[PDB]
């Protein structure tokens, strides 16, 4: 599996992964904010 | 009036005359078809 880094550029993999993490974390955090139950700053009641 | 063909090219004038008269002949026939008294196909009272 370490042969991946001879085949793939580590920088473009990490930039690709970090971009995916940045977008995914933002989308999930935003999705929770849109829901009444999981909007932590809205302070809704279960 | 044969001196006309020393000034105007006879060959191009004939083509110009035929195409031009074609449009005019169609135009006048269509004008009569628009009228009530001269549309021979409708045959309205004169």
């Amino acid at each position: 599996m370490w042969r991946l880094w001879k085949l793939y550029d580590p920088r473009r993999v990490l930039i690709g992964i970090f971009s995916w993490l940045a977008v995914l974390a933002l989308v999930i955090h935003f999705i929770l904010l849109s829901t009444d139950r999981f909007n932590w700053v809205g302070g809704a009641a279960v | 009036m044969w001196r006309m063909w020393k000034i105007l090219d006879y060959r191009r004038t004939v083509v110009l005359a035929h195409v031009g008269m074609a449009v005019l002949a169609l135009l006048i026939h269509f004008i009569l078809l628009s009228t009530e008294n001269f549309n021979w196909l409708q045959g309205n009272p004169y």
Partner: protein, 48 residues
């Protein structure tokens, strides 16, 4: 002549052309006589 046709070929084409035009017009005249016999296309003073 700015077509290439000689005098005799110009006359030969004219003879067939005039004959073809006359045969075309003759059929058209027969067609119009049959058409007029069916329904005349010139209205009278009171119309059709």
């Amino acid at each position: 002549s700015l077509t290439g046709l000689s005098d005799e070929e110009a006359k030969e084409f004219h003879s067939i052309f005039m004959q073809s035009f006359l045969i075309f017009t003759a059929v058209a005249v027969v067609a119009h006589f049959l058409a007029w016999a069916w329904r005349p296309w010139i209205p009278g003073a009171e119309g059709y």
